[PDB]
RNA sequence: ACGGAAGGGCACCACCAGGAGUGGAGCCUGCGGCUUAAUUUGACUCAACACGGGGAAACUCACCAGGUCCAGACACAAUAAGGAUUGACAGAUUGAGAGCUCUUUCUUGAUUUUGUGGGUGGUGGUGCAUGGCCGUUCUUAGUUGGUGGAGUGAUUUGUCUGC
RNA sequence: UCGGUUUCAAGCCGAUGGAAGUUUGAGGCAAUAACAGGUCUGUGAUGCCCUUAGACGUUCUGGGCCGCACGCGCGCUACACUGACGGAGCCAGCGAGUCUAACCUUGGCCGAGAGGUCUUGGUAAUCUUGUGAAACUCCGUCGUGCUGGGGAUAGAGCAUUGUAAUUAUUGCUCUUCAACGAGGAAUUCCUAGUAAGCGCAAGUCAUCAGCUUGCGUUGAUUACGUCCCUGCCCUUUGUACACAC
């Protein structure tokens with residue numbers, strides 16, 4: 001989709017850091033609550049994300065929930081240059 | 097462009113929170129569910145039938 | 148003290164009312180109208196046939212120092 | 227009677243910056259009045275002004 | 290907040306509904322009877338009656354953690370006020386809602402209808 | 408099952424006794440028809456026709472006259488750092504202050520463009536391919552099986568004369 | 571309970587008693603077998619087909635769904651003197667209502683009105699609200715003829731909703747003042763606080779109720795029966811019907 005590499009990894013962090021997304025289905029919301037972009041961009045990015053793997057989705061009343069797989073946790077190295085397994089999302093953050 | 101979503105409340109703003117449906121919306125107490133969608137999910141929302 | 152409590156079911160609504168007139172004697176010391184919310188729509192999903200109507204109902208019943216903070220531990224609220 | 231694409235004529239990349247005597251940066255065209263044209267864009271020259279390349283919204287700077 | 294008890298009790302059950310046909314729409318394939326929402330001080334405990342239950346902790350913590358932060362993100366709950374207690378259903382042969390899902394998957398693997406219904 | 412066949416029984420969606428009417432008038436509103444660029448459409452006995460919660464100025468919007476956009480995911484081949492893509496002041500433009508397309512020559516940085524597939528959305532079609540729900544038959548009392556009894560059998564008795 | 575009744579019964583009828591004696595009144599629930607009944611125009615329910623960039627996707631601008639020789643279905647308002655109007659008396663119940671905000675609105679002024687305005691209370695058994703509703707009730711005016719019954723049609727002006735009122739959104743003011751003189755053949759609904767008359771809240775909803783879902787106020791006439799019509803149920807009967815008169 002039409003979004004230069006400062007956008008598709010505008011979040012390459014909220015994904016690996018937080019772990020999941022929420023986005024009520026609203027193209028032209030253009031201001032995601034909890035994230036700095038169009039709400040269109042996250043979903044279309046998550047589309048592009050899920051349709052390659054690394055992340056799943058579920059729908060339940062127009063709220064487009066996303067979740068990522070262990071396949072994600074080694075794809076956030078090719079252009080998401082982070083130290084290998086130095087950290088993850090559902091690891092020791094608040095109670096793990 | 098910026099002429100994309102360049103128009104408005106009324107029916108065009110409201111929709112059932114289950115199907116995106118603009119029509120036949122039940123909004124008394126602000127639940128915002130289709131009459132049809134309401135009658136299915138009404139069992140556990142709190143509305144039982146007595147009389 | 149003064150507490151106001153509410154719920155939809157009545158049993159565990161009145162398993163605290165009694166459970167508070169018994170902490171009322173905790174050291175040998177010191178009903179609202181029910182609100183029925185009516186949703187009244189059609190049985191049919193489309194438009195066909197006998198024109199049949201169907202009321203639903205929610206029933207809302209409401210009632211009303213060291214020992215204070217260990218009494219609040221159904222919709223619980225107090226001021 | 228169908229619609230049409232965009233030509234976006236590429237040119238053989240940035241066409242203008244001049245070497246003097248092999249050499250030194252001699253420069254040509256104009257810059258804007260912002261650090262959003264912070265020496266990463268020197269302004270266009272189309273017709274009647276030197277409008278930006280990055281500041282295509284505000285900042286019609288002239289000299 | 291600032292809602293008359295009418296409009297939030299409505300929105301209490303709406304929350305329960307969306308929660309539920311979220312849960313069913315999410316983990317029917319793992320076995321799931323209803324959900325209990327404890328309206329309790331501090332936390333809002335969501336006890337989940339489930340048939341097969343270890344489908345909630347993944348890499349020893351990695352699943353309910355993935356869910357707890359999910360329900361709050363949509364419902365704007367600040368972290369740690371949503372406790373996802375994950376119980377196990379009372380006598381799973383008690384729930385039509387469970388067994389219907391036990392058959393939806395059963396027939397969805399080609400087992401003859403008279404076979405997998407009877 | 409049906410009978411302008413018999414015996415019972417029972418209903419104001421039956422009559423009787425009557426009320427209040429409707430059918431006539433004016434306007435509201437729905438259906439047809441005619442009309443139209445389109446007058447979106449579903450439903451036609453009860454059980455279509457102030458019914459689709461259908462009280463439509465925009466939205467709704469499905470129709471009609473036009474104008475944008477991709478919100479064409481992912482794979483492959485292509486383009487590709489000596490420019491892939493994207494964008495735009497003003498005018499020409501146009502309902503428009505819209506850079507859709509042209510003039511113009513600046514941006515922009517592998518983000519998506521060209522193509523083959525392959526998706527996706529679809530108030531597009533089929534309620535004579537379905538689910539769920541609903542209406543109706545049917546507001547009435549009716550329906551079934553185990554065992555034995557009758558019959559080669561389909562079937563029947565049970566589920567009955569009378570009250 | 572007492573009697574009358576039964577045919578032993580099941581019950582039915584009368585009475586006294588009682589807040590209550592038609593299952594006490596009214597509802598919710600509701601079987602088996604079915605219909606090619608209706609709904610893909612409620613679903614991010616869905617098989618197959620069609621479409622997918624000059625799009626049937628989507629958005630934006632503007633029009634239409636309202637368009638008027640005509641037929642029909644639900645209704646609203648009336649032909650008046652058991653009325654219209656003007657003062658006056660003044661009595662309900664079911665409900666809904668605002669903070670990632672502008673809902674229900676009292677009281678003070680301004681305005682003939684519609685409405686305008688500065689406060690105000692209420693997340694509501696508290697406040698709006700006794701919702702001072704309307705029919706109705708007391709007192710007057712009019713005088714039988716389209717009249718002061720009737721308010722359709724239309725002109726002119728002032729307001730409100732809303733980016734936007736033109737093909738009047740709706741409210742107000744004055745003016746215009748049509749058919750209609752109790753509705754042919756037909757035909758709907760109804761047995762008690764029911765029919766009908768009367769208004770009110772709720773759904774809708776930015777604005778718009780002549781609609782619907784309910785609630786109370788005033789409150790009758792007439793049957794407490796039949797199988798004539800329409801028609802359901804149970805036997806028995808006949809059939810050349812079985813896609814079933």
Ligand SMILES: [Mg+2]
Nearest residue numbers: 429430431432
């Ligand atoms: Mg008429």
Ligand SMILES: [Mg+2]
Nearest residue numbers: 420453454543
């Ligand atoms: Mg019938």
Ligand SMILES: [Mg+2]
Nearest residue numbers: 465467468634
């Ligand atoms: Mg329109």
Ligand SMILES: [Mg+2]
Nearest residue numbers: 468630631632
């Ligand atoms: Mg339009």
Ligand SMILES: [Mg+2]
Nearest residue numbers: 469529530626
């Ligand atoms: Mg469409």
Ligand SMILES: [Mg+2]
Nearest residue numbers: 534606607608
């Ligand atoms: Mg059908």
Ligand SMILES: [Mg+2]
Nearest residue numbers: 554555556564
């Ligand atoms: Mg036998």
Ligand SMILES: [Mg+2]
Nearest residue numbers: 563564565566
């Ligand atoms: Mg038999």
Ligand SMILES: [Mg+2]
Nearest residue numbers: 545600601602
């Ligand atoms: Mg039945």
Ligand SMILES: [Mg+2]
Nearest residue numbers: 534535606607
């Ligand atoms: Mg058919």
Ligand SMILES: [Mg+2]
Nearest residue numbers: 529531532610
């Ligand atoms: Mg479809």
Ligand SMILES: [Mg+2]
Nearest residue numbers: 461463635636
């Ligand atoms: Mg229409």
Ligand SMILES: [Mg+2]
Nearest residue numbers: 456458643644
């Ligand atoms: Mg009708």
Ligand SMILES: [Mg+2]
Nearest residue numbers: 654719720721
């Ligand atoms: Mg008059």
Ligand SMILES: [Mg+2]
Nearest residue numbers: 654655656706
């Ligand atoms: Mg009077």
Ligand SMILES: [Mg+2]
Nearest residue numbers: 420421758800
């Ligand atoms: Mg009749």
